Amino acid sequence: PQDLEFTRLPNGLVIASLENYAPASRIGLFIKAGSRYENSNNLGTSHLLRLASSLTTKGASSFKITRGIEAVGGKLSVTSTRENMAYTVECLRDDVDILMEFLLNVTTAPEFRRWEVAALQPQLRIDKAVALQNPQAHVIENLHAAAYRNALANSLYCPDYRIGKVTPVELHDYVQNHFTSARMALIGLGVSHPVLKQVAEQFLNIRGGLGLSGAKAKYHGGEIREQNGDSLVHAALVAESAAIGSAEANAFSVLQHVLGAGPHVKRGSNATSSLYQAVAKGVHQPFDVSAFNASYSDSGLFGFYTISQAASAGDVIKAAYNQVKTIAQGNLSNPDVQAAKNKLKAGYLMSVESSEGFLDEVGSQALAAGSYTPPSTVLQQIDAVADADVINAAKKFVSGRKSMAASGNLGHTPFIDEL
Amino acid sequence: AVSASSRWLEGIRKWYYNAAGFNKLGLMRDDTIHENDDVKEAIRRLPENLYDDRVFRIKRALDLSMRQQILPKEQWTKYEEDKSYLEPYLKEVIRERKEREEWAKK
Amino acid sequence: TATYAQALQSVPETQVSQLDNGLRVASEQSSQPTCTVGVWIDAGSRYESEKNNGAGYFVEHLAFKGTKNRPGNALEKEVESMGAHLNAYSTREHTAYYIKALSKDLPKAVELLADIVQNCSLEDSQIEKERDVILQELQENDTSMRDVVFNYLHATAFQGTPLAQSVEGPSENVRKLSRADLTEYLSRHYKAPRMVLAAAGGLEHRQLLDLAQKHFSGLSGTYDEDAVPTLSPCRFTGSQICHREDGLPLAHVAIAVEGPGWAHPDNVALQVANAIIGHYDCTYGGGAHLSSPLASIAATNKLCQSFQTFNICYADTGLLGAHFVCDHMSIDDMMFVLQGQWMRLCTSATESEVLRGKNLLRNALVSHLDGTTPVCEDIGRSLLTYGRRIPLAEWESRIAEVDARVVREVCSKYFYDQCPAVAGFGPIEQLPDYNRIRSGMFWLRF
Amino acid sequence: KRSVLCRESLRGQAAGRPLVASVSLNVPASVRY
Amino acid sequence: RYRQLARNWVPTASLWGAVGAVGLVWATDWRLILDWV
């Protein structure tokens, strides 16, 4: 009924709210601290911070905090990416107040006790371990660290050698410098904005400029290669995409989809996916491949991902490239761009068809722009992309510094010079 | 309304501490504690410095006990220097457990 | 301002509607962009015979690969052209195919789905191509202990019943399977009234109803002669099935007590009960502070890697219990705490405790329903399960009647003195002897 | 570990606003795109 | 306070104790206690 309601304060923190109909409300304070905010000496402290969200803080002991949310059947999720760190908080309409006072403690009153922070430490390994089970995670990670040099090439997961060495002052300093007013965006899905503000005003007023971590962007072509014993091999090939919320970017997104192979059908094969077709024809029976597309504030990464077998690695890899070369040679007919488009549009909508989805989308936008762009407008922007534009962007991959990351038996994985 | 009493109370305290073997031993009131479950967790929470110190002082202590010799008058623990360094840590531990107990009522 | 209860009552009611043949039409409106139309057929793996044990599941690989109208890749292309994702999921009681797509795409959406369900262009080439795929999926499923164990469970609790067969089906029935057999399968089980055409989002019920291509109907009886239950009770024998492989790093245990069908007043109370025990993983942020004992103990004492209580609900059968993956030297301690929890539950539940689980349930049950896909499945499946009701707002009421005595009496029907259904996939060398597990369901001491 | 032998592979990353978003929640936990 | 938490046990606990006390005497069969039934 009532649409969202943004409001930038004097501090510069953003806040939104949507009194929805249904029974479930969810706050989420998104602080601007991603993994790109750590240095050589600070690496792995966001990771630990992410995992220390239930520790004692100034008003609420670790015990109260967890038993408290249990009391009421809430959930407290602490999500992070290379650029941001969403602190989610779900619970029943009637219990938001009990819950909010928890989110506030957790975020503005953390008390990292030597003893408490010390117990955690080992959790990092356990966490890292489970996430590194998906080749995607280590390759994807390795990708970022090869393509960047300084900031976005920092991974999400603590470096093995740092684990036990993440000190209390480190956490306290990261909170202090990054968990600040200018970088924050409140976001409610079932709360009163009037009452939200009040609270935001009372609890979120802290000073801290950007880049006390060492903010800045830079792309650098590089290749990280991980040999294994596994039959299958994964590899990424990516060159500087266009930036976040910019036209070029958007273009990329649309091109992405022309090749992009995320199956829309269970047990179904893509007929739409060029990459898949092309790859497929020159490739063996079992394989899988998809267009990769990343966009961040101050740079992007666009290019594709492959999953071949030991002796097909190259064939696949090249095949994919060649095809994306085709579009950059100009060869791309109108029919396919419009399908792509509609694919993308559909996607975005579904992406925001959920509370959790919406709440992410909103916060996300808060941190980038400073307001909420409605869907419609969104939709218009994507449509504006020119059928040529797409090609043009694609031209850029082929004529853009390469950066690749592979895993598995790498006898048959092309190097930079190979392609 | 404790003015004379407080001073009087303070006076009584110095004599007990001085009188106690702990002052003579050189181990601060905090090292004399009965090591139980709460004390145990507070202990674990101690800094390397604080913590290693307790280990040496008890080391030196149990060494004297073993030999039945007292430390020199010059080197004793003076009441005015009551490092209640455990207290801080020990408090919370209890604080946290009281809470837990209370949260379990209903 | 607005309060939980209020919100509840305000939610868009679901419109159930029927075609001449029994096609069921349901839909939840919101006047939103995306839509997820679906056809929730309810002929699953429990209707298959020993041979066609994997028939259904085989259909599902052909569902999307051709209609006489739309040959080789014409479905996907069109689906790709439409921009709507197409998924096909298959259970031991319920096969379903759905589309996600822009609300304006209903027109060609519902056409497509309808098309899919009925006409499936299946050539010998596609049959022999799928076979090879299936056989390879099977090999892959063997690589998943959770999937290996949960089958096991069903086979042992359902030993000697059609219900205990893998939806994936027997290895060699994939090889043998006669091309003629998929037809009979489809023909015999795809006939509504079984089927439901559901959907949620921005559409008008009115139009869904109408949009339904009225092309083929239920070729079945008008009388009781049909009444011979195809849904004949299935014995859920209590046994165990231990499959030790000291080569694997961790240990899978799935322990169960048989439970209510889909519809039963005891069946929500149970859920409130498993709210309390909960579920746990290596990565839970609360470890030692979690309020669920199994969770705290586990967290505290490095007892397990991940554990989850479940309520599997079938017409005439139910699987209740939890499942824990633990090092080889921790199997027994984990078995002790859990069963322990059960017992405590039916003798010693406190209102506090039940009230917290209560609330957990609500949330679990509200938050799932966020998004279009989710609402569509609830509406489809709800109709074959619980019949044509959408108990959503009721819930809170039903959930509300929950009392610590209610939860205690309801739990003791199903767990106390009752004989377990236990499967592992060793290191099960320390796994408790059947009689030990058994004696764990009553309280002398421990 | 889950075997990745067949046509089924369909994993590759690219979303609208979020890209490689890692969640750690008090209850659940995961890795998306 | 305490009784409410143990109320379920109290009823269940009460039954076991009476049964146990009676049973031991019954197995024991002390004459004075029995005379009353």
Describe the structure.
This is part of a larger assembly, with chains A (419 residues), B (106 residues), C (446 residues), D (33 residues) and E (37 residues). With 419 residues, chain A is α+β, with helices and mostly antiparallel strands. Chain A has 15 helices and 9 strands. Chain A has a 5-stranded mixed beta sheet with strand order 5-9-6-8-7, sandwiched between helices. In chain A, a hairpin with a 2-residue loop joins strand 7 and strand 8 (299-308). Chain B has 106 residues and is mainly α. Helix content of chain B is 63%, strand content 0%. Helix content of chain D is 0%, strand content 18%. A two-stranded antiparallel ribbon of chain D has the order 1-2. Chain E is mainly alpha-helical. Chain E has one domain (1-37): Single alpha-helices involved in coiled-coils or other helix-helix interfaces, CATH 1.20.5. The radius of gyration of chain E is 14 Å and the shape is elongated. The termini of chain E are far apart. Classes of the chains: A alpha+beta (419), B mainly alpha (106), C alpha+beta (446), D mainly beta (33), E mainly alpha (37). The interface between C and D is medium-sized, with 12 and 14 residues. Chain D: This is Cytochrome b-c1 complex subunit 9.
Question: What order do the helices and strands come in, and which of them pair?
Answer:
The structure is cut from a larger assembly and holds chains A (419 residues), B (106 residues), C (446 residues), D (33 residues) and E (37 residues).
Chain A: E1 24-31, H1 45-51, H2 62-72, E2 75-80, E3 85-92, H3 96-108, H4 114-120, H5 122-131, H6 135-147, H7 168-178, E4 184-185, H8 193-203, E5 223-227, E6 233-241, H9 247-259, H10 274-282, E7 288-296, E8 299-308, H11 313-329, H12 334-351, H13 355-368, H14 375-384, H15 387-398, E9 404-408
Chain B: H1 4-19, H2 21-25, H3 37-44, H4 48-67, H5 86-103
Helix pairs in contact in B: 3-5
Chain D: E1 22-24, E2 29-31
Antiparallel strand pairs in D: 1-2
PDB class: electron transport, oxidoreductase
Keywords: Respiratory, Respirasome, Mammalian, electron transport, oxidoreductase
Entry title: Architecture of mammalian respirasome
